[PDB]
Design a protein around this ligand. Structure first.
Ligand SMILES: OCCCOCCOCCOCCOCCOCCOCCOCCOCCOCCOCCOCCOCCOCCOCCOCCO
Lengths: 13, 13, 13, 13, 13, 13
């Protein structure tokens, strides 16, 4: 999976 | 499956 | 079921 | 491997 | 840089 | 003493 982020916020891709 | 994070702080998604 | 972490400092959630 | 980012947004390359 | 661990508990190095 | 890490790469400390 890894992550997706906008600025400082990251959640599972 | 995975974490939610804000900068360095991560908790279960 | 998961951790809560600041960087790699983690404890059970 | 790693991340592509444009402006504030990053996701898996 | 990086983190020092004993077992699963880690602090900034 | 235990182990030390940078990223995914770690070793004794
Ligand atoms: O493994 C060794 C053995 C360990 O043993 C004992 C410990 O065990 C304990 C249980 O383990 C569970 C570990 O904790 C779960 C943590 O979640 C996974 C973290 O994965 C990524 C690793 O690199 C990052 C380190 O920063 C962490 C921040 O998280 C962000 C989520 O990742 C996205 C990438 O973050 C890089 C961020 O950007 C660039 C850098 O600037 C920060 C700004 O972020 C902006 C975003 O942009 C993205 C662009 O890169």
């Amino acid at each position: 999976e890894g992550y997706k982020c906008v600025x400082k916020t990251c959640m599972p891709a």
